[PDB]
Symmetry: C5
């Protein structure tokens, strides 16, 4: 019967009165646009610059009174991806976006559909680097919230309003996991608005939730720091007759603790406030230091006993310091370590 290319030229082109530079249903209530977001591949989240790489598909549907053929026997039509200028897709930008170039492999990576009523389907895979203002109040637990702000640019609130969907809000790629964080399935979403000096613009957003999968942090720094503290404890028992060995153990244990505390913040961005690591390393450096101090006091009692040679009293005092020291370090460390964990587990359960 009729040719498909003849019908495609009759629908969009010189036969069509619309030039596509005018918004559909002009001088009428703004046409809402439904946006479904599918995450092709989450990951590559940069912690030192507070950003993340994600490619979404951005399928958007709107209705127009134009482009209603109502003469083909099927429900929808799969259009070419070379007719993108005739559709007049709406404007959309991200307000926290870095880079975000398009994709091009053998064609434009775009989808196009059109039904009898005018409901269209237009999805585009775009790799988006987005800046997120993560709050690193506690570095190991580190509940983070990542956002994406779907915003228009040039069409006001009384001209173009975006909206979400009701059958599914944000889908995710099947069988995708992240080593750094586990993606929460809550997918809390809502929408704000913008008030600039030129008008009222719509701003639709979506909030993600990322918690740290603990394990790596413990092996990398919690386990070495612990062993280092343990080494200091053994020093008292390791050396009794000769003092030098204890001195040098305590010196280099403090130096390697400061080296590890300096090396732990290399991947971290520069921030003013104090994290949990910056409490843990400081208190373990306090313990190792304090032990060395205790040692200085023991050598002072020994030097007083040497310059005196009350001999029994001095020996007794030294022995007492030695036997009280070693008993005291585990209880003051165990109570603190357990206390720290409880004071962070209960704030984790209060946050979650």
């Amino acid at each position: 019967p009729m040719p498909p290319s003849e019908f495609l030229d009759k629908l969009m082109g010189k036969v069509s009165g619309y030039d596509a530079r005018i918004r559909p249903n002009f001088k009428g209530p703004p046409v809402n646009v439904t946006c479904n977001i599918f995450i092709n591949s989450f990951g590559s989240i940069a912690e030192t610059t507070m950003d993340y790489r994600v490619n979404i598909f951005l399928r958007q549907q709107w209705n127009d009174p134009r482009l209603a053929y109502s003469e083909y026997p099927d429900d929808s039509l799969d259009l070419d991806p070379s007719m993108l200028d005739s559709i007049w897709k709406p404007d959309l930008f991200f307000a926290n976006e870095k880079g975000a170039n398009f994709h091009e492999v053998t064609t434009d990576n775009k989808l196009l559909r059109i039904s009898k009523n005018g409901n269209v389907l237009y999805s585009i895979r775009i790799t988006l680097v987005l800046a997120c203002p993560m709050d690193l109040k506690n570095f190991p637990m580190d509940v983070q919230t990542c956002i994406m702000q779907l915003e228009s640019f040039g069409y006001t609130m009384n001209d173009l309003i975006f909206e979400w969907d009701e059958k599914g809000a944000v889908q995710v790629a099947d069988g995708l996991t992240l080593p750094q964080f586990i993606l929460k399935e809550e997918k809390d979403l809502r929408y704000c608005t913008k008030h600039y000096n030129t008008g009222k613009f719509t701003c639709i957003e979506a909030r993600f939730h990322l918690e740290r999968q603990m394990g790596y942090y413990l092996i990398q720094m919690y386990i070495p720091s612990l062993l280092i503290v343990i080494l200091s404890w053994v020093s008292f028992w390791i050396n009794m007759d000769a003092a030098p060995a204890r001195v040098g153990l305590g010196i280099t244990t403090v130096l390697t603790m400061t080296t590890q505390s300096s090396g732990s913040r290399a991947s971290l961005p520069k921030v003013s406030y104090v994290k949990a690591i910056d409490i843990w390393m400081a208190v373990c450096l306090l313990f190792v230091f304090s032990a060395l101090l205790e040692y200085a006091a023991v050598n002072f009692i020994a030097r007083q006993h040497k310059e005196l040679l009350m001999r029994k009293l001095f020996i007794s005092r030294a022995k007492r310091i030695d036997t009280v020291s070693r008993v005291a370090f585990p209880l003051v460390f165990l109570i603190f370590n357990i206390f720290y964990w409880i004071t962070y587990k209960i704030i984790r359960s209060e946050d979650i």
Copy 2:
């Protein structure tokens, strides 16, 4: 006789009724497309971000009822690379793709052929960075699987279906080797499918297999860690009369072991679970530590003997600890090292 450019304009252009925006054999069974993949140069695999750089050639053949001249005396025709829009090549994208720009040196790097029946040949060299979800369950052996997902975008299962080839599936560049891994020639391949909220899309894949060429890992960390353990063993024999020297050997051996264990995970991505290196380094740090501990006990027996001066008994006990220690360390290390290797060689042979 007839001019070639006149025939080329008669075949594609104003004389041709097709505009090339319509799929061939429209309102008919989907035209399958045969895909042959040739790897120009594998390599540059990034371990810290789980990706790899590869340039394939992507020769794809399909048949159309149009573009059948049946008037030239030869079988096929070599077309210009400026007539790419007239062919209407099918859409194809990769679902795990980062970047992947085109190549441009003096022309478009594209091939074009057309036969009397309509079987075309279209290959394109594209440098593709693809993200692979490698599982680093054992870091030194590390059997990995890399995939490439040939997928359409805009044409459903009842509109366009891709397929593989039967005379050769994935070819590889002659005389190409990789320092990091040796490419398996098994080339296991199959194809999945996709079910989105818009329709059923085809997804053709191909699985590669990469195992680590062992050697470098052994020289870099297995040999230094071993020597370090050996150094600790010699300490007992190195120093008998004077205790300090043993103390300081054990301290710095533990500190350099923790330094090497911290420096070994710099190229590694942050991951929660425990690798074979994280067992080996932990057990060797246990051995070196344990030796230092044993030493603390020896100095405690020596200090008890000093504060007593049962003298013979104390000397005998110290001698016993010294002679049992040194006998015990090799057997408990050799049995463990051999055990570890057997428990990883048999899981390597069970995986392969």
Copy 3:
């Protein structure tokens, strides 16, 4: 009534006598252009290369005698973003600009408006990397000034003059903070001019003010350096009977101080003059060194007493050095540390 696309073609196109390649009100006084700057997202400031990444919106208004319809009942019209060549927007470039590519997500990210009189509205989100000549006279306080130079290129002072606005000068994105610096709200602004060998060109600028949010610097280097100094002080009290231990403490404390002083300048760019850190580290390395020196003198008095065995006098002198040393170090350190802070707090209050 009349069609909107017919009116849009009548206003700009073949019906319009202007080709848009001629400046509005040609052979007349230069048309001034009002520029409002909104900072979408400040941050990612590079300290080692003296630059910063910022995306502004750059809304610019000018009046033209052309494009005055005076026939529609509304005040303004929202034009398409495909008619950008018909407006003839003015030239604008930044004189300290690196890179600064455009943005492209589904359309041109541009705004276009036109009123009855001719006052237009044109804003463009452009991610601008700008080079700022920061003066690092004092590294921890580090009051910096960042500038952006709005400059024309091709239109002289008697041809095109830019100007600022009176209802708001530079706006900023609501709820945006920077970890490195806190943005001052003073927003001091003025404008310079340029005199090249081709003519007089306008150059409009805006000055920002960035001070360091102190805290991170103190934890990272001030607290470790302090502890190191404290360790040296304890050495005198730690060891009295045996000299070696003090020697080795002082050696490695000097070596780790030089290591920390070398590692502190890794993020810093290479600069000739002396910062506050380069005074602090040098004076603390002086203190630790001086202590070791004092120690050398004590061992010289001890060796003189040994080669003599005036015995009482030598013992008294050694004791005196030991008791004067330890009293002297805190007062000469506390007076200096307080002095340094006062001499930098008062220059901070004099700068602010």
Copy 4:
């Protein structure tokens, strides 16, 4: 007389029967193309990723029966660089190419010439990053071979064959030197061929030769490693009366040797086989270790003599070990160092 632009339009355009999409002398023997390569600037060779940056000029000449005016009085004509599509330059790609974008400063950086017979001249400066499979069998000498593979894409052996030149093959930029390697002037060249599954394609290549300019390697690692070995030798002579000092010298010399051996492979790519550095560092670490071992044996003889107090015999044995040790280390090191150099100098002279 006649206008030049009129003649340029008559030669190429609507008057010309060729559309330029057809190969010259179609249905005739393939037109060979002469390729002269000039290296504008060699350098920036990456060792960790096995690639190098080079910009060649790629002047290519071919003859066509068309475009023969034979009416101007001069020999050749210098055409515009905007008429590149009318010439129909042949296809050319590199089979080991990464990136390789074009250059653009104020025009297309292209040359165009045409003579009366039809011999054209077309050169293009293109910065080419090319991957070379260097074999690092011996790291310090390291004779490497870099290749460039000029290959067609779309025109078979019976359609288009490339060839080299006879008056000069590959020229090089005057007064250009490389710090890493000295470019050999031999410039050995030949050509292979390709056999794919679609046809026979020509592949013309050129081989370069790069040897390491020795010196830097010697200062950076050979001289420090030597000094370290020397330090170990002095230890025996440095300490005789007291054993600790020797113990600690040997410990830290082994630790700094392992640190230097770990730090030497940072710029190196990960490779399985053993280089000359990995023999040198291993044998010097063996020497330093062995010395420490010898020392353990001396302390065992000393402890046996202590637990005995045959006294003369034990003292004599210790003295003998001390005097045999120090005599033995230089001869066993000098013979080995000279042997290593001879066994690498003669394989260098056999390779060259």
Copy 5:
């Protein structure tokens, strides 16, 4: 009177006989082009890859017999930046150029002027990364010469010749300074020529002069190395009675000197020849080593005296070595340090 756009279309377009693809004054003496260079912002000079980033403005003037209106009452006309193809600007490329993309902020960043006679003005801000072959014969002083080679591509010496200017040669941005180097105002300039295998091409150049602003280098490495040497000197005076302490001081001072000498060449590119730093560090490592050696000899005299117990003679010899050592080190260091500075200050004054 007459319209400006009508005159602009009459001057360039269909009324003009020239197509702009032909050089002005064809079959006549080559039109020279005057080039004035203004440096917008020098800086970001990379030392490890021998390059630098600079954006010049490149204002070029040439005369043509065409485009002479001689009918407007003014001297010059400010043309649009959309008519760049009608002017036929000459070709220009840089022979040592990497990257160098164009700038694009709201328009083309180009200037265009035309007078009654035909003298045009065309400037373009282009950020140019240029490779300079710096000779690092002496690393701290380091007089460097940076060049820019203005060269044509496609027009021979008898077709197009570039030239410099007489009223100003290379201008620089007012109030611009560089932390690394101070720009010399001599601005020595001349021009070479090129002789390829296709013809004689013009090549105009300009030489800059960059010397290091000394200060940073001294603080970073000269001051730490000095202190380290000083520490070694104090060792002799620090320890007299006990030998171990001196041994360990000398060991770790040699180890930290080798660490600092290894860490000093990290920013440096790999080069074969010997710099001033590689003499200074080697001679200071010689001094520290030599001191340790001297010490070995002292302990040998002490061990000979111990195995003898000529007693007075041995004590006297040891005392003599101790008192000659300490006197000798400053004079042999001061004479050398002063000598080195004089031998580099006089070669600096001979170079300048």
